[PDB]
């Protein structure tokens, strides 16, 4: 039921290893090409969970030696400090570095997270309660500024924390996971992507977006970040009220999956066909399902409601949107949008959906569980 899937992923990206050599898939760009980088983006760490995810499903050492690879490449990025100002430090971290611990215990790449969270730790701003998302510390513009998809770098922190006994670490994810909560969740259970506080006493100001049609409407993406991110935090925090939030946000986007079982760009645009779609937004949420669901008592009916739910969106994209390794795609999902109001590629493969696809295929076929969390714990 998923081996094909898996399948077409493993050739895809066999060949893409072979292709890129030690550089980096980000997004592309009108063709079913990848545009690469240098390691200087927030994307980066999706390649190395790609590749430690397909070393965990085949025990192939070719994926392994990529992934370690990357991780060489990170401890050069960190080590001269390359575009690491801001939250994504997470994603950028905890499926590289943390992930090659997770996998294998490689104790140097166990330092490297460490590292990297402590970098992290320092995007922490006290007088506001917030990890600010973007741009140098007291931004005019973003300085007291906090976005959904942060939930998602908070599990760098945690795992930290646990790692050294050291309490800030928690202290300061669960009140970010708290104030986003507050804050960037809607009383419909929708969300705002990003919410603006007074840098000088954490008072709340206003909701907006820049990725999403309009600050009250519901970037999808943003949605599904916080489907994920709450159940993430649920898990490492024992928070009751955060697994709830993402049981909420989830059937808020569950009741609103068009026909072909994948998402618009934005749940309020017209749901028509000519309008541009995110597959990484239903890639994304499909794995927060699963997360949720593993939280759930079995005897709760819920559960297996989410994970059949979770089941039928990986059908959907793979009957939809995958792509079949035919020697040429570089890309495991069609029609993911990075930025589509700012005309960004907002019709092609995004290497978050790949990475959460995937991701998803493991949990199903696996029970692998990706890099946000350890194993067996």
């Given at each position: 039921?998923?081996?094909?899937?898996?399948?077409?992923a493993?050739?895809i990206?066999?060949?893409?290893l072979?292709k890129?050599?030690?550089?980096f898939?980000?997004?592309?760009?009108?063709?079913?090409?990848?545009?690469?980088n240098?390691?200087?983006?927030?994307?980066?760490?999706?390649?190395?969970?790609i590749?430690?995810?397909?070393?965990?499903?085949?025990?192939?050492?070719?994926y392994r030696?990529?992934?370690?690879?990357?991780?060489?490449s990170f401890?050069?990025?960190?080590?001269?400090?390359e575009?690491?100002?801001?939250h994504?430090?997470?994603?950028?971290?905890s499926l590289?570095?943390?992930?090659?611990?997770?996998?294998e215990k490689?104790?140097?790449?166990?330092?490297?997270?460490?590292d990297?969270?402590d970098?992290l730790?320092?995007?922490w701003?006290?007088?506001?309660?917030?990890?600010?998302?973007?741009?140098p510390?007291?931004?005019?513009?973003?300085?007291?500024?906090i976005?959904?998809?942060?939930?998602?770098?908070?599990?760098?922190l945690?795992?930290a924390?646990?790692?050294?006994?050291?309490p800030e670490?928690?202290?300061?994810a669960?009140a970010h996971?708290?104030?986003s909560?507050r804050?960037?969740?809607?009383?419909?259970?929708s969300?705002?992507?990003?919410?603006?506080?007074?840098?000088?006493?954490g008072?709340?100001?206003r909701?907006?977006?820049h990725?999403?049609?309009?600050?009250?409407?519901?970037?999808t993406?943003?949605?599904?970040?916080?489907?994920?991110?709450?159940?993430?935090?649920?898990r490492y925090?024992?928070?009751?009220d955060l697994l709830?939030?993402?049981?909420?946000?989830?059937?808020?986007f569950?009741?609103?999956?068009?026909?072909?079982?994948?998402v618009?760009?934005?749940?309020?645009?017209?749901?028509?066909?000519?309008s541009?779609?995110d597959?990484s937004?239903?890639?994304?949420?499909?794995?927060?399902?699963?997360?949720?669901a593993?939280?759930?008592d079995?005897?709760?009916?819920?559960?297996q409601?989410?994970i059949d739910?979770?089941?039928?969106?990986?059908?959907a994209?793979?009957?939809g949107y995958?792509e079949?390794d035919?020697?040429?795609?570089?890309?495991?999902?069609?029609?993911?949008?990075?930025?589509?109001?700012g005309?960004?590629?907002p019709?092609?493969?995004?290497?978050?959906?790949?990475?959460?696809y995937?991701?998803?295929?493991?949990?199903?076929?696996?029970?692998?569980t990706?890099?946000?969390?350890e194993?067996?714990?």
């Open positions: 039921m998923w081996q094909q899937a898996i399948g077409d493993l050739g990206t066999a060949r893409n072979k890129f050599g030690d550089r898939p980000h997004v592309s760009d009108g063709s079913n090409k990848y545009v690469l240098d390691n200087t983006d927030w994307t980066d760490g999706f390649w190395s969970g590749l430690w995810l397909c070393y965990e499903y085949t025990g192939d050492e070719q030696e990529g992934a370690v690879r990357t991780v060489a401890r050069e990025r960190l080590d001269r400090f575009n690491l100002d801001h994504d430090i997470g994603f950028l971290y590289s570095a943390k992930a090659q611990w997770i996998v490689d104790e140097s790449a166990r330092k490297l997270a460490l990297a969270a970098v730790m320092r995007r701003r006290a007088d506001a309660g917030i990890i600010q998302a973007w741009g510390k007291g931004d005019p513009e973003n300085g007291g500024r976005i959904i998809d942060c939930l998602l770098n908070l599990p760098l945690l795992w924390g646990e790692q050294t006994g050291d670490y928690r202290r300061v669960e996971a708290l104030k909560r804050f960037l969740v809607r009383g419909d259970d969300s705002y992507h990003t919410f603006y506080f007074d840098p000088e006493n008072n709340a100001i909701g907006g977006t990725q999403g049609n309009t600050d009250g409407s519901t970037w993406r943003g949605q599904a970040w916080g489907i994920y991110g709450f159940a993430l935090n649920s925090l024992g928070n009751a709830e939030t993402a049981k909420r946000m989830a059937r808020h569950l009741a609103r999956v068009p026909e072909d079982g994948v618009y760009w934005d749940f309020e645009v017209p749901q028509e066909p000519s541009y779609r597959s937004a239903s890639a994304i949420t499909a794995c927060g399902l699963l997360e949720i593993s939280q759930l079995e005897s709760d009916p819920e559960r409601r989410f739910a979770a089941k039928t969106t990986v059908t994209l793979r009957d995958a079949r035919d020697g040429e795609a570089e890309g495991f999902i069609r029609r993911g949008s990075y930025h589509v109001r005309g960004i590629s019709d092609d493969y995004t290497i978050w959906g790949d990475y959460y995937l991701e998803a295929l493991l949990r199903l076929e696996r029970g692998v990706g890099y946000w969390y194993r067996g714990r």
